[PDB]
Amino acid sequence: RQWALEDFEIGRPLGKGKFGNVYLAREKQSKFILALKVLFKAQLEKAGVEHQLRREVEIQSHLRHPNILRLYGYFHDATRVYLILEYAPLGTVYRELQKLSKFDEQRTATYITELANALSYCHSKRVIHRDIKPENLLLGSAGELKIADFGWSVHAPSSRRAALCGTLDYLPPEMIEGRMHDEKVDLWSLGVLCYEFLVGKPPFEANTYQETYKRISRVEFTFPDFVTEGARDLISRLLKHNPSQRPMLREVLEHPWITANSS
Ligand SMILES: COc1cccc(-c2nc(Nc3cc(C)[nH]n3)cc3ccccc23)c1
Structure with a gap:
């Protein structure tokens, strides 16, 4: 439960997103396909959402259900917060x-x-x-x-x-x-x-x-x-x-x- 940009290979963008895009990622160890949400710190910073993100995350963490997109976890860098999400292949x-x-x-x-x-x-x-x-x-x-x-x-x-x-x-x-x-x-x-x-x-x-x-x-x-x-x-x-x-x-x-x- 202490992840980094390097546990993951990065594929193409699934799509243009709001504070950043989603990318195909693959856990290097399991070889498991995943989605990666990129959330830029400068953009959360402005908009006024920083603590709203924090709120939603600490909640979504403890929700496991077949019909809820799993959050597996998250982590940040200098410039970006990264959400490690389930991949829903269809649109x-x-x-x-x-x-x-x-x-x-x-x-x-x-x-x-x-x-x-x-x-x-x-x-x-x-x-x-x-x-x-x-x-x-x-x-x-x-x-x-x-x-x-x-x-x-x-x-x-x-x-x-x-x-x-x-x-x-x-x-x-x-x-x-x-x-x-x-x-x-x-x-x-x-x-x-x-x-x-x-x-x-x-x-x-x-x-x-x-x-x-x-x-x-x-x-x-x-x-x-x-x-x-x-x-x-x-x-x-x-x-x-x-x-x-x-x-x-x-x-x-x-x-x-x-x-x-x-x-
Ligand atoms: C604006 O609509 C957006 C934005 C970002 C990604 C997609 C998108 N997502 C996924 N799957 C996903 C996305 C995540 C976080 N987990 N699984 C699949 C897609 C397929 C075709 C086009 C778009 C796709 C849409």
């Missing part, structure tokens, strides 16, 4: 949803099954409010999703203003109104995601901050024609204004639309 769900436009019920219901497991285990570890939008989602080699919502792992560079609203569309009423909140915020995310997987855009898109504030606080959304009865049933239950009328994660996994559709 982000975001890239997939861009070629496809939308997923079918089987895939969507599987995605939701895995986020529920990752989420219930998160809640069991006292960890809540997980940023599960599609660009925070990687695909492993079996097509299985991995939540990558820390260290800017798979964040594309952005304007800082572009990042501010990174997650507005995924925020529950109790968070955009500034009231206090509990684990139930993840159940609302799940509902957004489910709607986004089926239709190709999250339910509350709008132009202005204010218009998006309105649509979220008073839960104004509609389903297109094709969204089937069971899916509307599920989404509808998850997108309830009152936090405590949202299902337990358990009843999400037992919902008959999920069981009809996953694996």
Whole structure:
């Protein structure tokens, strides 16, 4: 548990990142393929994120779950902080949803099954409010999703203003109104995601901050024609204004639309 740049061979960049890029790395000893996040100190320094990184890391360290991108560890140098991450060979769900436009019920219901497991285990570890939008989602080699919502792992560079609203569309009423909140915020995310997987855009898109504030606080959304009865049933239950009328994660996994559709 005391790593350095030299335990690792360095391959190509997997992609342009936010405070640095991700690279293919290979542990010299095991010959194990890995991803390496490069986080430049000068850029964390400015942005004002230095201690936020520190926070996220010391937490992500103690989280082991098939649907969470493992952090194996990290280390720094003169100029860079290095995150040693699991490698998810396939893209982000975001890239997939861009070629496809939308997923079918089987895939969507599987995605939701895995986020529920990752989420219930998160809640069991006292960890809540997980940023599960599609660009925070990687695909492993079996097509299985991995939540990558820390260290800017798979964040594309952005304007800082572009990042501010990174997650507005995924925020529950109790968070955009500034009231206090509990684990139930993840159940609302799940509902957004489910709607986004089926239709190709999250339910509350709008132009202005204010218009998006309105649509979220008073839960104004509609389903297109094709969204089937069971899916509307599920989404509808998850997108309830009152936090405590949202299902337990358990009843999400037992919902008959999920069981009809996953694996
Ligand atoms: C902006 O989207 C980004 C940013 C950085 C890397 C990728 C990316 N990542 C991975 N896998 C990864 C990445 C990590 C930290 N573990 N496993 C695979 C890809 C494949 C095609 C294009 C892009 C990929 C995307």
